Amino acid sequence: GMDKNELVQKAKLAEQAERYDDMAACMKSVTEQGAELSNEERNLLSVAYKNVVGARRSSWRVVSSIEQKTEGAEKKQQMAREYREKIETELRDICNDVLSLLEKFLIPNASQAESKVFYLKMKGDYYRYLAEVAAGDDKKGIVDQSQQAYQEAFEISKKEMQPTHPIRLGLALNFSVFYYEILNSPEKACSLAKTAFDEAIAELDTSYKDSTLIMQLLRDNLTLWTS
């Protein structure tokens, strides 16, 4: 029993104190009240979750790897598996919250293209994270939902946003990394990223420090990936 402003203010407090689970529980409730998030509220929800899920992925990547490199001890390699499993389920829960928030509230309520694209991209990111950690039975289907969502995002951004809008460019960045690291299609990763970099070069050839940072990241990927 707390009101939307109060929730938003608590979220900012939690953000400051680096308490992101708190910050996420706050903005999850704001979202659950059913009204379309302003830019400010959407950004706070994104921040919270990016940090809440990112601590887990990072933890996962470490434990998983230790489990790869533990080849010998019959137990040393079971405890690491079990610990990976606990972390994975914490992670699957986090994505499943977010994905559900997206499906029930954020996408259906988005009145503007920029926010549609942002939420769709986020749905692509969060399925991507579930794909990372899926055992191959449900791993082709999660992978499809990721692509499906990034594709929808890409469609709208191509129609409604400037090639240099940072949300469109971040979408191209994430989706091209998806192609390369998840779907193993280096040529699809490459063409997406080159065409997004070139289109953004073309429209500027006619506030862009942020756009520009993303253009560099796409470029860096390109040169890494042709190598």
Binding site: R42, N43, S46, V47, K50, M122, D125, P166, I167, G170, L173, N174, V177, F178, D210, L213, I214, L217, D220, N221
Partner: peptide, 10 residues
């Protein structure tokens, strides 16, 4: 950043 809400890959 302005960019930290975009959850950028790499």
């Amino acid at each position: 950043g302005x960019l930290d809400x975009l959850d950028l890959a790499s």
